[PDB]
Symmetry: C5
């Protein structure tokens, strides 16, 4: 255990704190969604609840090491409190997001980080026509709140949201689920801002 | 990254803590509102829920630097925990305000600070006549709870509320919305207190 | 700002922790109420909700200074976390009190402290006859949970509650509201305990 | 105040942490209940809500002192965070207990500790027949979750629950209320476990 | 008490932090369930609430000692905050789990740890046919969120869930209850992940 304890000590306690991405040192984050369930729809306030888990991937030079020097260690698990994390937020949320999983991430010797947080979200969506055979469609945007496109960029490995873990006896059937990257231009700010737009079509079971 | 790490170290770790504005050395905060949605109205308790995001701007001499000495760095992002923030509160709230965005602010080399917090608020408002063609009007005041006029002052760049991001399929239509500065005298206290009055006119879609 | 930073350093960091009033060092706290609104009444559980703000005043010798020695500073604002505060509680509450304002207090050079906390409270009250012209009356007691009369005493500047900020379009009109000091003798303890009784008479709008 | 500050420093900062009771060195806790109100009964889930305050008494040799050596000080108030406290829990609760009072305890020169916490509790109880003249009866057990009988023992000064502070206009009348000590044997574990069973008989007013 | 204080000091303060299991130093956790009550079923969102307590057992070499050297001490109780704990999570939860018991664990001289946490959980379950004589069946999986099989394995002493403490007057009758170990293979990852599946059969009184 001595080698892992030493590597951790050298990485986090010796060196100073990482101050995030800049225009000179930008980074890209890969996003992915696994939809688990549509728990409820509120027709009187136009609010819809989702249960899912997000995939977050990024790489930093400040986090890499030589495995040979630390007794052939390629990777390790660490609390998300010990490392820098991106600030990915939902634009149309109506209540604070609830966390449903432990906050631990995995770090590999090349500097790659993987973080998989599970959560419940309430957002703006009109459910009129969910009782029909054709169904109703809704969308929600995810992205960094404070950083532009010159500091953080976003990427998706596929445009098909993972439905391999969707609840079979849910009150609502999934007709389509997509994850597409998009660019925005805001009046306030002269820089573009990048997002990933989650679009879902569904109906009553 | 060494230069940004150095600037941050010199600003926050070397010098002591800023003890807030005084009567001798006072400051001014600029406010602005972006209304997103009227989620629900409760006719039985006269309570109304609002989802929006606030614009906060102030300047401090203790936060400025020469970009030339720190490798031509003009600005940076930092956690709101690291810097002093104004104590802006709503006078007619009925439940504690819910935060819906990350707490990160931006600092420029001249000492200017920008902070944009997203939140949900419940306040006192009679909705009688929202079902009419003319609609109903309500208001809520914002300002520093503990600081007087001789300590903190308020300013608005415009009188019109930003409605460019208002939810298109909301159950309620916005007829008018304004942000206007006020100066008040309370019975308790011999000093005046400044606030910004948010007045919204709406009806059923 | 150097003088205020120095005064604060000398008061809180040099000297040791204040261990609360004793029988050889007792203190008196002044109380006062500003009623804002009666939000709801529950006839099925006999519970009533209130929104208001309290006035707290006390003096300590450990907090006084000479303004002349610290560049003519008479007073300053500080987080309630930095100073000792009285343990004032409501005897008939049914749910934990919600805080609705920042926790900042003001300290003057003579050692006087002023703290104004805003809050929402749920307490025991039978609302039978609120629909009548005569209305219904209810009461709630406030005071120190642990400290007796030989450690902490209470005082009120007036016996009339401040109704100058009561919500005009509330579902309930106030007929009368009063604040009066009481001395209680409990079976548990040979010492007496001091409290202030808030009595409100109201009816439907 | 110098003497009290000194005594506190010598007790908590000089000596090491108390590691809780053992087999070779056990202790006894005295319990007592003051019933304030039965707030609501839920016939659809068989859940009942109670508002009350508990009496906790224990003695430790590590907490005693000579008053003569510390300027004739017999007792003092201290935050429950500074001292060891027993882990008394409710076996049939359905939601986490809500605290309704400050967490301060009193310590005397002989080593005796007194702690009086006020709280709201939801537990399993079938209310069928509360509308009858005979009424309905329910019970709930309190005791240490982790320590057996060979480490912690329990005691009651009386078997008659204190009803001198029960809410006069409650929707429910108290017929009888008792506090009795019990010794349990669980299938899992070879040691005996002690508890105090609270039994209440009530009906509609 | 000097010996126990010394043992605790030598174990936690002298040696460095345990960095969690690895492929070179893996461990196994034993699980067990005691079902207490089915509090409510929501047919409109397909959500079910459970109240129970879990059994957790694991062994570490970093936690063993010679009783002879520490005055014949075989075991002791300690706060779960002082030791490493497994990240055992429910896959189909819809709201954050509520804790209903103190967080204390027991450590024996051979390095074995026992932790018994009590909790309330809301998960995905279709209750259609609970009103029938045959009843309805539902399931939920438990296991570590981040560690694979080569780091954490699971075990059960029996396949029958403990029903000796199930609430007699519950609105729902239990007909069956089993705990069974499973091995999952995920696309994302190259190692197999283990879980323990909880299956309950029930109906209305
Ligand atoms: O910088 C600002 O806002 C931040 C940048 C953008 C715009 C609002 C919010 C905060 N950011 C949105 C973010 O890019 C986002 C977009 C879509 C989904 C998630 C996050 C700003 C806006 C108005 C006035 C002054 C400053
Ligand atoms: O300082 C006081 O009041 C504080 C200052 C002002 C007045 C009430 C509240 C607390 N503060 C209001 C603040 O100026 C404000 C106004 C409008 C919207 C938000 C905050 C005070 C109150 C009662 C007795 C003694 C002193
Ligand atoms: O010290 C006790 O309780 C404290 C003293 C009194 C009684 C309850 C509570 C805590 N104190 C009441 C408090 O002074 C108060 C009364 C009314 C409104 C607010 C606070 C006590 C009670 C019963 C048995 C042994 C000790
Ligand atoms: O020690 C255990 O549980 C603790 C001891 C007992 C049994 C459950 C709970 C926790 N304890 C009950 C406790 O004595 C109690 C009883 C009544 C009211 C409060 C606490 C245990 C249970 C099952 C398998 C292995 C170990
Ligand atoms: O490693 C991953 O996720 C972890 C492994 C598995 C799958 C989700 C979660 C985190 N783990 C589930 C866990 O094994 C579990 C299974 C059953 C009950 C509780 C926990 C992952 C998932 C998607 C894309 C890239 C990487
Ligand atoms: Cl709900
Ligand atoms: Cl920003
Ligand atoms: Cl709601
Ligand atoms: Cl409500
Ligand atoms: Cl103030
Ligand atoms: Cl929107
Ligand atoms: Cl007390
Ligand atoms: Cl309620
Ligand atoms: Cl409920
Ligand atoms: Cl145990
Ligand atoms: Cl870990
Ligand atoms: Cl992972």
């Amino acid at each position: 255990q001595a080698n892992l304890m030493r590597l951790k000590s050298d990485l986090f306690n010796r060196s100073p704190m990482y101050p995030g991405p800049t225009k000179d040192d930008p980074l890209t984050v890969t996003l992915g969604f696994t939809l688990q369930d549509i728990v409820k729809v509120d027709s009187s306030t136009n609010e819809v609840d989702l249960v899912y888990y997000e995939q977050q991937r990024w790489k930093l030079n400040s986090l890499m090491w030589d495995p040979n020097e630390y007794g052939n260690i390629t990777d390790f698990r660490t609390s998300a409190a010990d490392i820098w994390t991106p600030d990915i937020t939902a634009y149309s949320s109506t209540r604070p997001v609830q966390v449903l999983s432990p906050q631990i991430a995995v770090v590999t010797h090349d500097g790659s980080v993987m973080f998989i947080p599970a959560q419940r979200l309430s957002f703006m969506c009109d459910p009129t026509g969910v009782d029909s055979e054709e169904g109703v469609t809704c969308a929600v945007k995810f992205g960094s709140w404070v950083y532009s496109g010159f500091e953080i960029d976003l990427k998706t490995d596929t445009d098909q949201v993972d439905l391999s873990s969707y609840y079979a006896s849910s009150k609502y059937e999934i007709l389509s689920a997509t994850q597409t990257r998009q660019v925005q231009h805001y009046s306030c700010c002269p820089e573009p801002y990048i997002d990933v737009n989650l679009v879902v079509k569904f109906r009553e079971r």
